[PDB]
From Swiss-Prot, chains A, B:
Organism from which the protein derives: Lacticaseibacillus casei (Lactobacillus casei)
Localisation: Cytoplasm
One Gene Ontology biological process: methylation
Main location: cytoplasm
Protein name per UniProt: Thymidylate synthase
Keywords of the record: Cytoplasm, Methyltransferase, Nucleotide biosynthesis, Transferase
C-alpha cells in the first residue's frame, strides 16, 4: 500500500528504538538516520489509516509559497498551527498586560481549569492580528519562518534571495543539475531561533522527464508530526512538477532523529492495527500554472476516505 | 562485510540506474535518493576492495579542521586534490601570461601530447604557492571551500560563525539535541560558485553514549568519489567522538543524485568481482584531545590490507 513506509517507520521506532532524554521531555523512542520513498505516480501520500486534514496542509504550504511570514493569512484560512510562536512573542514585553502565560504550553499540558483564560486570551490575539493591521504587522510577522527562508534569504550585503524561484528557473533552464537545493538551515540565525527548521534541506531531481524530491528533516515527530510532513512536500513536489511541465516521480523522505514520544505509544499501536485503504488522488487547476499565484481551490484531493482520526496529546 | 553498502550501491546504479545527461557530460547512470549505514564500531570504513590512499583523506580533513582555505598546507602535505580550482583562478587575469590553458582539464582529457606543458606549468604554480607568501595568499586561498564553511561562516552583519566549534560545544553541553547540524549550503554564494558543496549538510546524534553522524551529499561520483567521501566523514565521526569522550556509533550516508559515469563502468565491474577482506582499524593519539590542534601522525590506521588499486580516468 502507499503509506506503508510510514507504518513501518513507527513499527521500527518501537522495535529497534533506543530510549532518549529530549528537549520536550516527556521522553522519546528514537532511531537515527532513516530514509522512506513514495511513488507519487501511484497516488497522493496522505494517510488513509487516520483522518489527516488536508485543508491545513494546503493553506500552510501556500503561505510558504507566497513567501509569507504573517500569521494572518493562516488564521484568515481557519489555520492555527503557528499561533503559539507569534503569541509567545506577544506575551513579549510592552503592550501585553493581563492575565499571565509565564510559559504556558506545557502548563495547560500539566493542565489547569485555566485553559479557558489561555484560549479566551488567544481568541483576543487572533482577532487582533486579523482586524488590526498594526497589530498583525508587529505581532504576527514570525520573522524567519519557512516562507522567508525559501523565498527571501537575507544576504550579507543587503539583499534577498528568492532561492525557490531561482531553482524553479534552474529546473526549467537545466533539468539535469545536481545543485538544485533549497536550504532553510541558516547558520547565524540558528542559536537565536525559536524553532531552528526541522525541515532543513531539499533537493529536486529530474530523470527521464519526471521529478523526484528528497527531504532532510533533522528531528521528526513520528505520530503527530510526520504524517502531515509527508503531505506538504509531496504536494510541493506535484506543484513544482505542474509548473515546469514535468511528470511526478517520487518523494523521498530522509530523516535524522525520527522519534516516538512515549505518550503516543498507545495511539501509534492502534493505527498500526488498521488496514490501509486505496490512496487519495490530487487534481490541480490545469489553466493556472504559476503556483506562486495559487490559492486554496486550485489544489484538490479526490476521493480521500480515511479511517477515523486518533487525537492524542501534544502541542 | 563492512564496505558492502557501497558495493551494493554500485550494483544498484547499474541495475535500476536511469541514463542521464549531466554537467561533465561523458554520461552517467544515476539513481535519486539513496541511504547507506556503516557501524564504525565494527571497523574503520575505508575500502579493502581497492587501495584507497588514506593519507590524502587525513591531510584534506585536517585542512578543513583547521579552518584553512590555502592550498599550501595541502601541497606542503603532498596533497594535490584541490589544485585545479586555485590554478583555474591563477589563469585568471593579470600576472599570468604564457603558455595558455583556455579550459584545460577536459582538454588534456581529450588529451594532447601538451599535457607536459599543463604539468610543467602546474609544477611552476605549486612551487610558487609554497615559496611565495604573496602568491600563495592571493592564488592559493580558495575562498569558500569547506574549511571556511564549517569553521567561519560569514554573517550578514560582519562576523564569522565557527559552526563546527559551536556544535562540538553543543554535544558537550547537550548530547540529546536535535538541532546539531553543520551546513555548507550557503544560498547567496551558490550561483557564483565554482563547485557548490557536494557535501551539503551533516547532523551528529547521540544515543546511549555513542555518536552517529548522518551526511547529505547532493551529487556523488560512485567509483572515484564516493570511496574517499565515506572515509572523510567517518574519520570526522571518530575524531569528534574522541573529543567529546564519547563512543562511536554509525556513519549514515544519505545521497541525492548517486551516479556512475559510464567510462568507469568497466572498472566498477572489476572491483565488484573482488571479495572484501577484514576492515582496517583507527588509532588516535590518546593524549591530545583537541582535534582542531591535530596533525597528521595523531590519526593512524592499523592493518589496512587492500586489493590493488583500479586507476580509471576522471579529473
Ligand atoms: N507552540 C508550538 N507547539 C507546537 O507543537 C508546534 C509549534 N509551536 N510550531 C510548529 C510545530 C507544529 N506542531 C504541531 C504539533 C501537533 C499538531 C497536531 O497534533 N495536529 C492535529 C490537530 C490537533 C490540535 O492541534 O489540537 C491533527 O491531528 O490534525 C499541530 C501542530 N510545533 C513544534 O514545535
Ligand atoms: N578540477 C577538479 N576536478 C575534479 O575532479 C575535482 C576538483 N577539481 N575538485 C574537487 C573534486 C575532487 N575530485 C577528484 C576526482 C577524482 C580523484 C581521484 O580519482 N583520486 C585518485 C587519484 C588519481 C589522480 O588524481 O590521478 C585515487 O584513486 O586515489 C581526485 C579528485 N573534483 C570534482 O569537481
Ligand atoms: O509539524 C511538526 N514538525 C516537527 O518537526 N515537529 C517536532 C518534532 C520534535 O518533537 C520537535 C522539534 O524539536 P527540536 O527543537 O529539538 O528539533 O517538533 C512537530 C510538528 F508537529
Ligand atoms: O571527491 C569528490 N566528490 C564529489 O562530489 N565529486 C563529484 C561528483 C560529480 O561528478 C561532481 C559534481 O557535479 P555538480 O557540480 O553538477 O554537482 O564532482 C567528485 C569528487 F572526486
Amino acid at each position: 500500500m502507499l503509506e506503508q513506509p510510514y507504518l513501518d517507520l513507527a513499527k521500527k521506532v518501537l522495535d529497534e528504538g533506543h530510549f532518549k532524554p529530549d528537549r520536550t521531555h516527556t521522553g522519546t523512542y528514537s532511531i537515527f538516520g532513516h530514509q522512506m520513498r513514495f511513488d507519487l505516480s501511484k497516488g497522493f501520500p496522505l494517510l488513509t489509516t487516520k483522518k489527516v486534514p488536508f485543508g491545513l496542509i494546503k493553506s500552510e504550504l501556500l503561505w510558504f509559497l507566497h513567501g509569507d511570514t504573517n500569521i494572518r493569512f493562516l488564521l484568515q484560512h481557519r489555520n492555527h498551527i503557528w499561533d503559539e510562536w507569534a503569541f509567545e512573542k506577544w506575551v513579549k514585553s510592552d503592550e501585553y498586560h493581563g492575565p499571565d502565560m509565564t510559559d504556558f504550553g506545557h502548563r495547560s499540558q500539566k493542565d489547569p481549569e485555566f485553559a479557558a483564560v489561555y484560549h479566551e486570551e488567544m481568541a483576543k490575539f487572533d482577532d487582533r492580528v486579523l482586524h488590526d493591521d498594526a497589530f498583525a504587522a508587529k505581532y504576527g510577522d514570525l520573522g524567519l519562518v519557512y516562507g522567508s527562508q525559501w523565498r527571501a534569504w537575507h544576504t550579507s550585503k543587503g539583499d534577498t534571495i528568492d532561492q525557490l524561484g531561482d531553482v524553479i528557473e534552474q529546473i526549467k533552464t537545466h533539468p539535469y543539475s545536481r545543485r538544485l537545493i533549497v536550504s532553510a538551515w541558516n547558520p547565524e540565525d540558528v542559536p537565536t531561533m525559536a524553532l531552528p527548521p526541522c525541515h532543513t534541506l531539499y533537493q529536486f531531481y529530474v530523470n527521464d522527464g519526471k521529478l523526484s524530491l528528497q527531504l532532510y528533516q533533522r528531528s521528526a515527530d513520528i505520530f503527530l508530526g510526520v504524517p502531515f510532513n509527508i503531505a506538504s512536500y509531496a504536494l510541493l513536489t506535484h506543484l513544482v512538477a505542474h509548473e515546469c511541465g514535468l511528470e511526478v516521480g517520487e518523494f523521498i523522505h530522509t530523516f535524522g532523529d525520527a522519534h516516538l514520544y512515549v505518550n503516543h505509544l498507545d495511539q501509534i499501536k492502534e493505527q498500526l492495527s488498521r488496514t490501509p485503504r486505496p490512496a487519495p488522488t490530487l487534481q490541480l487547476n490545469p489553466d493556472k500554472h504559476d503556483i506562486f499565484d495559487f490559492d486554496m481551490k486550485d489544489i484538490k484531493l479526490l476521493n480521500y476516505d480515511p479511517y477515523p482520526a486518533i487525537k492524542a496529546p501534544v502541542a
